[PDB]
Design an enzyme around this catalytic site. Sequence first.
Site, PDB file in Angstrom:
ATOM      1  N   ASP A  58       1.944   3.602   8.101  1.00 39.75           N
ATOM      2  CA  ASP A  58       0.802   2.687   8.109  1.00 39.75           C
ATOM      3  C   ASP A  58       1.165   1.322   7.527  1.00 39.75           C
ATOM      4  O   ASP A  58       1.837   1.235   6.498  1.00 39.75           O
ATOM      5  CB  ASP A  58      -0.369   3.299   7.332  1.00 39.75           C
ATOM      6  CG  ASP A  58      -1.649   2.491   7.467  1.00 39.75           C
ATOM      7  OD1 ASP A  58      -2.510   2.869   8.287  1.00 39.75           O
ATOM      8  OD2 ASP A  58      -1.788   1.469   6.760  1.00 39.75           O
ATOM      9  N   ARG A  99      -0.172   8.974   1.473  1.00 41.57           N
ATOM     10  CA  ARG A  99      -1.060   9.047   2.634  1.00 41.57           C
ATOM     11  C   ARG A  99      -0.643   8.102   3.773  1.00 41.57           C
ATOM     12  O   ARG A  99      -1.102   8.262   4.900  1.00 41.57           O
ATOM     13  CB  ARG A  99      -2.514   8.789   2.216  1.00 41.57           C
ATOM     14  CG  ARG A  99      -2.926   7.325   2.170  1.00 41.57           C
ATOM     15  CD  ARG A  99      -4.177   7.114   1.325  1.00 41.57           C
ATOM     16  NE  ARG A  99      -3.869   6.383   0.095  1.00 41.57           N
ATOM     17  CZ  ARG A  99      -4.010   5.067  -0.070  1.00 41.57           C
ATOM     18  NH1 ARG A  99      -4.479   4.297   0.915  1.00 41.57           N
ATOM     19  NH2 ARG A  99      -3.684   4.513  -1.236  1.00 41.57           N
ATOM     20  N   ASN A 100       0.217   7.125   3.480  1.00 40.43           N
ATOM     21  CA  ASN A 100       0.732   6.193   4.492  1.00 40.43           C
ATOM     22  C   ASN A 100       2.160   6.509   4.955  1.00 40.43           C
ATOM     23  O   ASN A 100       2.769   5.715   5.670  1.00 40.43           O
ATOM     24  CB  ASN A 100       0.659   4.760   3.964  1.00 40.43           C
ATOM     25  CG  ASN A 100      -0.765   4.320   3.664  1.00 40.43           C
ATOM     26  OD1 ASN A 100      -1.709   4.728   4.339  1.00 40.43           O
ATOM     27  ND2 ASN A 100      -0.924   3.483   2.644  1.00 40.43           N
ATOM     28  N   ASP A 148       0.771  -1.248   0.000  1.00 37.61           N
ATOM     29  CA  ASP A 148       0.000   0.000   0.000  1.00 37.61           C
ATOM     30  C   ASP A 148       0.807   1.307   0.000  1.00 37.61           C
ATOM     31  O   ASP A 148       0.341   2.349   0.467  1.00 37.61           O
ATOM     32  CB  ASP A 148      -1.096  -0.049   1.077  1.00 37.61           C
ATOM     33  CG  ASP A 148      -2.133   1.074   0.939  1.00 37.61           C
ATOM     34  OD1 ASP A 148      -2.156   1.777  -0.094  1.00 37.61           O
ATOM     35  OD2 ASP A 148      -2.930   1.256   1.883  1.00 37.61           O
TER      36      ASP A 148
HETATM   37  C1  LIG Z   1      -1.548  15.773  11.724  1.00 41.10           C
HETATM   38  N1  LIG Z   1      -1.229  14.365  12.084  1.00 41.10           N
HETATM   39  C2  LIG Z   1      -0.164  13.788  12.640  1.00 41.10           C
HETATM   40  C3  LIG Z   1      -0.451  12.429  12.732  1.00 41.10           C
HETATM   41  C4  LIG Z   1       0.454  11.376  13.291  1.00 41.10           C
HETATM   42  C5  LIG Z   1       1.625  11.742  13.966  1.00 41.10           C
HETATM   43  N2  LIG Z   1       2.454  10.817  14.476  1.00 41.10           N
HETATM   44  C6  LIG Z   1       2.190   9.489  14.351  1.00 41.10           C
HETATM   45  N3  LIG Z   1       2.858   8.385  14.769  1.00 41.10           N
HETATM   46  C7  LIG Z   1       2.219   7.234  14.424  1.00 41.10           C
HETATM   47  C8  LIG Z   1       1.093   7.626  13.752  1.00 41.10           C
HETATM   48  C9  LIG Z   1       0.104   6.660  13.204  1.00 41.10           C
HETATM   49  C10 LIG Z   1      -1.253   6.893  13.197  1.00 41.10           C
HETATM   50  N4  LIG Z   1      -1.788   5.780  12.638  1.00 41.10           N
HETATM   51  N5  LIG Z   1      -0.724   4.905  12.342  1.00 41.10           N
HETATM   52  C11 LIG Z   1      -1.122   3.647  11.703  1.00 41.10           C
HETATM   53  C12 LIG Z   1      -1.517   2.540  12.663  1.00 41.10           C
HETATM   54  C13 LIG Z   1      -2.812   2.025  12.617  1.00 41.10           C
HETATM   55  C14 LIG Z   1      -3.193   0.996  13.477  1.00 41.10           C
HETATM   56  F1  LIG Z   1      -4.447   0.512  13.429  1.00 41.10           F
HETATM   57  C15 LIG Z   1      -2.274   0.466  14.380  1.00 41.10           C
HETATM   58  C16 LIG Z   1      -0.978   0.971  14.422  1.00 41.10           C
HETATM   59  C17 LIG Z   1      -0.600   2.002  13.560  1.00 41.10           C
HETATM   60  F2  LIG Z   1       0.659   2.475  13.612  1.00 41.10           F
HETATM   61  C18 LIG Z   1       0.457   5.436  12.680  1.00 41.10           C
HETATM   62  C19 LIG Z   1       1.036   9.096  13.687  1.00 41.10           C
HETATM   63  C20 LIG Z   1       0.150  10.019  13.145  1.00 41.10           C
HETATM   64  C21 LIG Z   1      -1.729  12.228  12.205  1.00 41.10           C
HETATM   65  N6  LIG Z   1      -2.223  13.421  11.800  1.00 41.10           N
END
Ligand SMILES: Cn1cc(-c2cnc3[nH]cc(-c4cnn(Cc5cc(F)ccc5F)c4)c3c2)cn1
Length: 250
Positions: free
Chosen positions: A135, A118-119, A114
């Site tokens: 992701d 976006r990931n 994927d």
């Molecule tokens: C403005 N903004 C910043 C973020 C952000 C900032 N730091 C981050 N560190 C890790 C993430 C993140 C969020 N979802 N994921 C995917 C994920 C999904 C899941 F179901 C289980 C684990 C996993 F890592 C990683 C993440 C998201 C999201 N939006």
Amino acid sequence: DLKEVPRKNITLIRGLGVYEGQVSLQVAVKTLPDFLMEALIISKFNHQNIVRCIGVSLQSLPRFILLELMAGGDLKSFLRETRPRLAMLDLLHVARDIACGCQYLEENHFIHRDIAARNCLLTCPGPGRVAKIGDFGMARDIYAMLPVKWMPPEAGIFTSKTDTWSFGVLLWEIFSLGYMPYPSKSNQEVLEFVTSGGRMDPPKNCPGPVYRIMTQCWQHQPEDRPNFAIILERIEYCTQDPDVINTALP
Ligand SMILES: Cn1cc(-c2cnc3[nH]cc(-c4cnn(Cc5cc(F)ccc5F)c4)c3c2)cn1
């Protein structure tokens, strides 16, 4: 297996997208309203271009996963929001960063399935950014919603050359500055367009060398596409080329 961190030590600071968090260390918290296994997958990786799994909180509810805070958010939104109104070398570093992570996955015989803008997440928004693969939901699901624009024809087969294709498309995303692949085409149109041999044009102002990396990523036959070592090598060659680097963004 995973480092269970006490809920007592965890505090939620701010909603990011999905929370900004602290542990008695600034972290990102992902909450659950499957999920035991995305964290288990991310936890097993040890590479600078893949977000770290700090820990988990499966004792209390709602269940948390503690992750490396990426203050810059996703790469898709960054490109969009930071569109000139940023240099070519910034794009090349982002590309290199994800290519390193992909090489790490390839070396470890893990298929992402994927790879898209976006990931990918960014550590900080300003210079000194580091892009990392954030992701792994798709690779977990297996282990309309399908990412057809990032998938090669034979994807229902999946290889490390699958990720090579999607990286090519990621490459377009980067040098288009966050545009949707095959802009005016739907999943089914893209499906038939690709299957016939159709490929995306260069993004606006994109140097030939960079587009040439996209082009061989999108080779019809998988064995003709390059592995990620070659891709990095070629991204490094672009980073040496000044005609590439001196080119002004749109
Ligand atoms: C403005 N903004 C910043 C973020 C952000 C900032 N730091 C981050 N560190 C890790 C993430 C993140 C969020 N979802 N994921 C995917 C994920 C999904 C899941 F179901 C289980 C684990 C996993 F890592 C990683 C993440 C998201 C999201 N939006």
